[model samples]
Target: VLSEGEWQLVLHVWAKVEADVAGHGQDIHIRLFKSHPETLEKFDRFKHLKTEAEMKASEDLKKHGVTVLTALGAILKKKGHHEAELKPLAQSHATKHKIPIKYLEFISEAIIHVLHSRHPGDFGADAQGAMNKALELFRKDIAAKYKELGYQG
Candidate 1:
C-alpha cells in the first residue's frame, strides 16, 4: 500500500488519467520524471492503478512515443560513454516528444545511484558525473531547438 505521501503522489498520477479512457494519459503525466520501466511497461505491481489505468498508460505510450524506454535501454548498454543515446534523443527532438533530456538524466542518475550503491568498488562519481553531463548537454541542445520552433522547454 502507498503511504500518505505515496498515496498523494499516486493520486496526482491517477487524476491525470484522461476521461473517456481506460487509464492514465500518454502525456508522461507522472509527477516523477522517471518510473520503474516495468511498472510503466507492464503495470503488474502498480496496485494503485486499476486494470484500466494500466491499459490507458499503455495506450498513451503508443500515442506519444517510447522515447523514455528507448533512451534508458541505450544508455544502460554502455559500460562507459562510448556513444550517446542519439536514436531516442533525436526522435524526442523531431517529435518534440514528452521526455526532456533532463528527465533522461534523472533516469540516468537513478541508474548511477543504484550501481554505486550496490557496487561501490566499481562505480565512481566521476563516471556518473560524465554521464549526467552528457545527457544534460543533449537536453540543452534540444531545448534550444524547441525554442526556435516556438515552444517552451
Candidate 2:
C-alpha cells in the first residue's frame, strides 16, 4: 500500500505518461515492499518516500534502468540462457530523450532466438518483422552501439 503522497506521485507519472504515449496500453506501476524492506522501513515510514522530488534528482529514473536490466538478466539466467556473454552488450531501459527502444527489441529478439533455437521449428515470421521494425526505429533514432551489428534490413 502506498501513502497518499505515493499515490499522488504515481498518478502524476501516469498522467504524464498518458499525455506522452496517448491511446496506448496505458502505463503501469507495481509497488514492492517485502522485496525492499529497507526502503519501506526507512523511506515510507518516517522518511521521504519521494526521493526524486526532494532533490529533483534523476535517481528514480536511474534506479528504474537498474531494475529493468537486472530483472531481464535474472529472467534470462533462470531460463538457462547464457547472459554472461550477453550482459556486457545489454542495453539500458528506454529513457526520456534516448528511448533506447532497441534494448527492448534486442531483449525480445534474444528471447525468441533462444526459444526457437531450442525448439528449432517453432519460429514465427511476424515476430521477426516486428523485431526488425523495432531495430529500424531505434537505429534511426536512439541506438548508439548495436547499429553497427547490422541486425536491421
Top-TM-score candidate index: 1
The collision pairs in model 1 are 26-60
TM-score of 1: 0.39
lDDT of 2 by residue, 61-118 (tens): 3354345444533433322233453333433322212324433444445433433343
Which parts of model 2 have CA positions greater than 4 angstroms off?
1-66, 69-112, 118-123, 144-153
Model 1 lDDT-worst window of ten: 16-25
In the range 20-107, model 1's lDDT, one tens digit per residue, is: 1221223232422235443343333343454445534554444433444345334433422323454435545546445544554555
TM-score of each: 0.39, 0.22
Whole-model alpha-carbon lDDT for candidate 1: 0.42
Which pairs clash inside model 2?
none
Candidate 2, residue 68: lDDT: 43
In candidate 2, clashing pairs total: 0
